[PDB]
């Protein structure tokens, strides 16, 4: 059973500190780069930090540089995030995610831990909709330094759950993702097409790519896909 389990969240006053932990089980933890990704309510996924398998290479989002420190203890199968100078804007569910070596896709996500602090470079449409059976395509616009230099990943987030990897390496599907989902990339843009739309596809979809100029991951703001009513099969005139 390959799992990630976060802990350490809670209610903290602005300016306070908190240390998060993420316990890995069911795989060789020391073989993988690891990430922290957070999300505020009704907002998009925001990448926070990553650390290489042997800790040599660390990266931070500009929003947290100097305040947060990532670390790991391979002997304890644990990832950590020491958070200092917390602000209301840091309130979010914090997820840890495992990164695949060859593709950089975040293939396993934890369940999240809630941090409450109280007393997007990629462009995606905020909304998309279709009726069951229609094909819906959503785009993700970037630039030379991100989509123009690296592969695109897509994540599906069913309402109130952790994201899951949907597409990696621009157009590849992990096991379990149906062939109704397909990814494409052209120039500095990418798209996700969902053929034969089903009610179960109602979710938020996020594109992500590494940005060579920022030395950080960039996530799109997310597209909320609504699956509308089936639409009249039978009409009547009198």
Residue numbers in the entry: 1 to 119, 137 to 255
What does the paper say about this structure?
C-terminally tagged constructs incorporating a TEV cleavage site leave five residues of the TEV recognition sequence post-cleavage, whereas N-terminally tagged and cleaved constructs leave only GS at the N-terminus. Interestingly, the C-terminal tag remnant formed extensive crystal contacts in both the C2 and P21 CHO-scFv crystal forms, as well as being crucial to crystallizing the scFv complex. In the crystallization of the individual antibody fragments, the positioning of the tag on the C-terminus resulted in a tag remnant after cleavage, while no remnant is left behind when the tag is on the N-terminus. As shown by both crystal forms of the CHO-scFv this contributed to the crystal packing, and its removal with carboxypeptidase Y led to a less favourable crystal form and no crystals at all in complex with Mcl-1.
Mcl-1 (myeloid cell leukaemia 1) is a member of the Bcl-2 (B-cell lymphoma 2) family of pro-survival proteins that regulate programmed cell death via apoptosis. Mcl-1 is an anti-apoptotic member of the Bcl-2 family which binds to pro-apoptotic proteins containing the BH3 domain, a short α-helical stretch of around 16 residues. Binding of Mcl-1 to the pro-apoptotic proteins prevents apoptosis. Here, we report the characterization of an antibody fragment produced in vitro against Mcl-1 which was formatted as an scFv and a Fab.
